[model samples]
Target chain A: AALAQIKKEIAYLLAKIKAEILAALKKIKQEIA
Target chain B: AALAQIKKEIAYLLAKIKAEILAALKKIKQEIA
Candidate 1:
């Protein structure tokens, strides 16, 4: 149960990071174009 | 000075995130092999 909880946390964190990076990339691309 | 500082902060954050992602990928790949 603890392991599962930790896995969920990791997944959540990575998803958050992915979202942030994608948003940043989109903004930067728009600025360039 | 403030804009330069902000740029540095953004660069640092992205580099740190990139390092974490790269390290995670390396570990996950090793685990599979």
Candidate 2:
């Protein structure tokens, strides 16, 4: 397993988590407000 | 260098991220509504 691949996957997971969290927040604002 | 230790830390980080995300969502609802 390449360390580069591991790093890439880790970054992608973190990025997805960040993106989804923001998206949920936006949706909540639209619903609640 | 135990595999169990690695798994433990990973779970902790994921749990913390989940908790903080929920907390942030709650705060956002309180603020926006």
Candidate 3:
């Protein structure tokens, strides 16, 4: 049970990081153009 | 100059996030054992 909970939490955190990196990349693209 | 600064900032943020997730995982392991 705890293991599953931790796995879910990690997945959530990873998705959040992916979104943040995407947003940062988009900003960089905009600055270049 | 601006681009390099932005890249450096992003690198710092990513490293910080990685450290936080690793710490969380370590804590979880300790809790289960």
Candidate 4:
């Protein structure tokens, strides 16, 4: 069960990280344009 | 402004759809793990 818990946390973090990266990219693109 | 031209489509789609609703959940977890 601990493994499952870890997996869930990992997934959530990844989603957050990706969201952050994408947001950063969007900001940069807007600045460039 | 042309409505900012969609910026990046896939990231927008992902955000709109919500990552948890996708089959890529496992891959996302592995990526961050």
i-RMS for every candidate: 13.3, 3.3, 16.5, 14.8
How high is the CA lDDT of each candidate model? 0.62, 0.71, 0.62, 0.54
TM-score rank order: 2, 1, 3, 4
Q: Tell me the deviation in Å of residue A29 in model 4.
A: 0.9
Cα displacement (Å) at residue A33, model 1: 43
The residue-level lDDT of candidate 1 at A4 comes to: 50
Query: Candidate 3 on B1-33: residue-level lDDT in tens?
Result: 655655565566667777766665565556557
Residues A1-33 of candidate 3: C-alpha lDDT, one tens digit per residue: 655565557656766986676566556555654
Please give the range of 10 consecutive residues that has the lowest summed lDDT in model 1 chain A: A24-33
Two-way TM-score contest, 1 vs 4, winner: 1
Worst 10 residues of 3 chain B by lDDT: B23-32
Which runs of model 4 end up more than 4 angstroms from their true locations?
Answer: B1-33
lDDT of 1 by residue, A1-33 (tens): 655565557556766886776576556555654
lDDT of 2: 0.71
Residue lDDT tens for model 4, A1-33: 655565557557757876776676556555654
Tens digits of per-residue lDDT, candidate 1, B1-33, equal 655655565566667778866665565556557
TM-score of candidate 3 relative to the true fold: 0.50
Query: Individual DockQ of the candidates?
Result: 0.03, 0.27, 0.02, 0.03
TM-score of candidate 1 relative to the true fold: 0.51
